[PDB]
Amino acid sequence: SKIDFVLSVAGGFVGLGNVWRFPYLCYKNGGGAFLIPYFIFLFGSGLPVFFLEIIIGQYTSEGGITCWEKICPLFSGIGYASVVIVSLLNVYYIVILAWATYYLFQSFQKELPWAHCNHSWNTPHCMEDTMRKNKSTNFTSPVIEFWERNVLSLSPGIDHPGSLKWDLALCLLLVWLVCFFCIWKGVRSTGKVVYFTATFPFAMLLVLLVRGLTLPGAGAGIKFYLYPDITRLEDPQVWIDAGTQIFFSYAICLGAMTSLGSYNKYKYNSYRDCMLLGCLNSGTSFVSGFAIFSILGFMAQEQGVDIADVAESGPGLAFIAYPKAVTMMPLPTFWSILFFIMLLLLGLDSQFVEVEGQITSLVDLYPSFLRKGYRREIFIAFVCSISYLLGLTMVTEGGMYVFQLFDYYAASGVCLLWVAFFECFVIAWIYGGDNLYDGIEDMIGYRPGPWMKYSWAVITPVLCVGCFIFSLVKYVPLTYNKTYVYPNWAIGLGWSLALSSMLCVPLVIVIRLCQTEGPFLVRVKYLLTPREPNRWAVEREGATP
Ligand SMILES: *[C@@H]1O[C@H](CO)[C@@H](O)[C@H](O)[C@H]1NC(C)=O
Ligand SMILES: CCCCCCCCCCCC
Ligand SMILES: CCCCCCCCCCCC
Ligand SMILES: CCCCCCCCCCCC
Ligand SMILES: CCCCCCCCCC
Ligand SMILES: CCCCCCCCCC
Ligand SMILES: CCCCCCCCCC
Ligand SMILES: CCCCCCCCCC
Ligand SMILES: CCCCCCCCCC
Ligand SMILES: CCCCCCCC
Ligand SMILES: CCCCCCCC
Ligand SMILES: CCCCCCCC
Ligand SMILES: CCCCCCCC
Ligand SMILES: CCCCCCCC
Ligand SMILES: [Cl-]
């Protein structure tokens, strides 16, 4: 039937990129103006690049870096770029789990701390959400106060880091020990039975979706979600945000999907899996958007303010709307605990894969010194310890601004488009898209349609180059919560996080050419020839030519 096929592919597609990052990227970039670039990218590059990575991993049966060595010795810096991207992503991704852990620990009390505002941390300007319109120039929602006063202690700027938050630093330490202990002991990402690890994220999202839609203001919230704003499409930032949100959700350009495709058998219809997971992954983001944007629609009409100015246009929208929804539910504390466990399990499974993914790449990159045993176990703690210390810069009071620097630059924006363009450019134009079909038709049993070939050759490079060029032409500097202007050095620092991964592709080209000996034209020709990528006798494999 069809349920067994869904069971075989599990439910690991859902992550924090769906229930945390998508809603606020949609919220920041107007309303439904985010969806047109979202779907254009999803059907032009999103699914094609995802399937390309899977099928390259399956064809070469190699990891992130060695697969590119098999496909094309030149442009092999894509693996190193992916390693840098995933390292920065692991540095800034565990902070979300730190916030989730803090919220979960704060939810273990009789009265939710964000339900009412009469506490110590609360500005006198705060007023209850119900009484803002029921009955002093501006008032603040208790939910937003708790987020920027208790959880983040927001400082005036990034240049004022302030004293470290010892409560978040421990919550950051706990999730790193969990990542360290699980990876060191070889614990699977899904604990025990996979049913609870996969059905629970959907069950909680359905409950939140049901709660959101029945709220009185949900009608105006969805009209904000769905109906687009064309004048927003003039801005080239919405295309970048929507384009790389697909890449972030699919975990492509990270080297994760190549390794995921490696475990697939040679004769395996991975084409169906990429389409099925891709639609389910992007489908969850669309459906989860209905839940959160209904809450904002309810929040905006309750406070008598616009939907576009009711919450934070930045990370933590899922920490303002969702904790607000659980306040309007029977047994609010019970649902608050479950939500932040789900929000924590989703992130932990994603973090388990990437931290182990980059470590596996790192140890295999420099063997004879990181050999399996005492040396590797120390390396497991070394990667986490350094990633913990660098992650401490986003825990200070001015740590939200540093988090937005990493989020907008380190593993999103031009750095993800740079790799996605170069993965498609090498396969479609250098290796040959028609050549890959001969490999694919031998693998999945039938030659696919012209969609995949024409998406690597044309659609993805034009989308990545076009968005890259037009982002620089109409350059608007990064801003946090649409009111804070970053200092020049912060953007220069942020551009370095992107540029650190982007420079791997040209730098390895320079290294490779100088390593090779001979005339320059002979040198470039030698490094563009694949080194027998389909070299496996375990299954029936036709020679590349
Ligand atoms: C106060 O609320 C008004 C009306 O929504 C808004 O125009 C203004 O920017 C707010 N000012 C502050 C300080 O939040
Ligand atoms: C908005 C959806 C974009 C889908 C792109 C599909 C490309 C197919 C090209 C086939 C040409 C023969
Ligand atoms: C003047 C003090 C500025 C402090 C800004 C902190 C930025 C942290 C960057 C972390 C790079 C990995
Ligand atoms: C700028 C920080 C990451 C730089 C990575 C460079 C990798 C070069 C490896 C060359 C191997 C032949
Ligand atoms: C985040 C910068 C360091 C990440 C390591 C990249 C790979 C180095 C070995 C070639
Ligand atoms: C007031 C009811 C709004 C319903 C919106 C359309 C259904 C979305 C289901 C995901
Ligand atoms: C007072 C701010 C403390 C920030 C600590 C940052 C540690 C970075 C280690 C590389
Ligand atoms: C550096 C990449 C140049 C690609 C030129 C077109 C393909 C050449 C090999 C057939
Ligand atoms: C615009 C100049 C920026 C200089 C300070 C930031 C550099 C970060 C990498 C060391
Ligand atoms: C007025 C309808 C209440 C709905 C509560 C939703 C709990 C799952
Ligand atoms: C953010 C980088 C952490 C260190 C990774 C290990 C380098 C060999
Ligand atoms: C669902 C609309 C876009 C379909 C793209 C072509 C798939 C073969
Ligand atoms: C390639 C564009 C770099 C822009 C850096 C701006 C630093 C002020
Ligand atoms: C005035 C320069 C501040 C630099 C902060 C650290 C950047 C890595
Ligand atoms: Cl998504």
- Compute, in angstroms, the gap from residue 504 CA to the centroid of ligand 11: 15
- For residue 225, what are its two tokens? 């979600």
Cβ proximity of 533 and 71 under 8 Å: yes
- What phi and psi, each to the nearest 5 degrees, are found at residue 480? -105, 125
- Cβ distance 275 to 47 under 8 Å? yes
3-state class (DSSP) for residue 238: helix
- Tokens representing 384 are 């986490």
The answer to whether 88 and 497 have CB atoms below 8 angstroms apart is yes
Instruction: Compute how many other C-beta atoms are within 10 angstroms of the C-beta atom of residue 292.
Output: 29
Q: Within the chain, how many helices (H) and strands (E) appear?
A: 27, 2
Distances (CA, A) of 5 to 201, 271, 342, 432: 19, 13, 24, 32
DSSP-derived pairing of the beta strands 484-485 and 479-480 = antiparallel
From 501, 532, 530, 439, select the one nearest 80 (Cα to Cα).
501
239, amino acid identity: W
Choose among 422, 442, 479: nearest CA to 75. Answer: 422
d(C-alpha 348, C-alpha 16), whole Å: 9
Classify burial at 231, counting beta carbons within 10 Å of its beta carbon; exposed 0-12, middle 13-18, buried 19 or more: exposed
Q: Crossing angle for the helix pair 194-213 and 270-303, nearest 10 degrees?
A: 40
Q: Which residues of 409-423 are buried (b: 16+ CB within 10 A; e: fewer)?
A: bbbbbbbbbbbbbbb
Task: Select from 490, 282, 326, 294 the least CA-distant residue to 404.
Answer: 490
Measured in angstroms, the resolution is 3.2
Compute the distance from residue 235 Cα to the ligand 13 centre, in Å: 18
Beta bridge partners of 484: 480
Residue 205 near ligand 6, beta carbon < 6 Å: no
- Angstrom distance (rounded) from CA 257 to CA 265: 15
Instruction: Give the phi and the psi of residue 305 in degrees, each rounded to 5.
Output: -130, 165
CA distance 396 to 417: 30
Q: Is 485 helix (H, G, I), strand (E, B) or coil?
A: strand
Question: Alpha-carbon distance 526 to 536, whole Å?
Answer: 23
Q: From the CA of 525, how far away is ligand 8's center (Å)?
A: 8
Q: DSSP labels for 4-50? A: HHHHHTTTTT--HIIIIIHHHHHHHS-SGGGHHHHHHHIIIIIHHHH
Number of the ligand 7 atom closest to the C-alpha atom of 389: 9
Distance CA 292, CA 276 (A): 24
Coil, helix or strand for 411?
coil
Residue type, 290: F
| 25 vs 9: CA distance, rounded Å | 28
Q: Which amino acid is at 215?
A: L
Maximum CA extent, the chain: 82
For residue 22, what are the contacts with CB-CB under 8 A and spacing of at least 6? Answer: 245, 249, 285, 288, 289
Helix or strand (DSSP H, E) at 198? helix 194-213
Closest alpha carbon to 326 in 211, 242, 216: 211
Strand partners, 485: 479
Ligand 12 centroid–CA 451 distance in Å is 8
What is the C-alpha separation between 173 and 401, in angstroms, rounded?
20
List Cα–Cα distances, 33 to 80, 175, 225, 388, 407, in angstroms. Answer: 34, 36, 9, 37, 21
Name the closest-CA residue to atom 14, ligand 1: 138
Residue 413 contacts by C-beta under 8 Å, 6 or more apart in sequence?
240, 244, 471, 498
233: exposed, middle or buried (Cβ count in 10 Å: 0-12, 13-18, 19+) = middle
Ligand 13 pocket, Cβ-based, cut-off 6 angstroms: 488, 491-492, 495
Indicate which residue's Cα is closest to atom 8 of ligand 6.
Answer: 290
Q: Which of 354, 501, 489, 343 is nearest to 415 (CA)?
A: 501
Solving technique for this entry? cryo-EM
Contact 313, 28 (CB under 8 A): yes
Q: Find the DSSP H helices in 399-538.
A: 399-405, 414-425, 433-443, 450-454, 460-473, 488-502, 504-515, 520-526
Quick one: angle between helices 332-365 and 194-213, nearest 10?
130
CA–CA gap between residue 385 and residue 391 (Å, rounded): 10
| DSSP code string of 310-333 | SS-SSTTSTTTSHHHHGGGSSSHH
**What residue type is 403 in one-letter code?**
F
| Single-letter code of the amino acid located at 244 | T
Using an 8 Å Cβ cutoff, are 161 and 396 in contact?
Answer: yes
**Taking the mean position of all CA atoms in its chain, how far away is CA 111?**
33
| Integer Cα distance of 402 and 437 in angstroms | 44
Measured in whole angstroms, the distance separating CA 180 from the mean position of its chain's CA atoms is 21
Say how far apart CA 214 and CA 207 lie, in whole Å.
11
What lies within 8 Å, CB to CB, of 167 at 6+ separation is 102
Record the tokens describing residue 198, joined without a space: 């996969």
CB atoms within 10 A of CB 540: 9
Q: Alpha-carbon distance 159 to 166, whole Å?
A: 20
Tokens in use for 417?
Answer: 């488009």
Question: What amino acid occupies position 309?
Answer: D
493: Cβ below 6 Å to ligand 14?
yes
Q: Give the domains, in start order, of the chain with CATH numbers.
A: 3-526 (1.20.1740.10)
Ligand 9 mean position, distance from CA 487 (Å):
11
Determine the length of the chain: 545
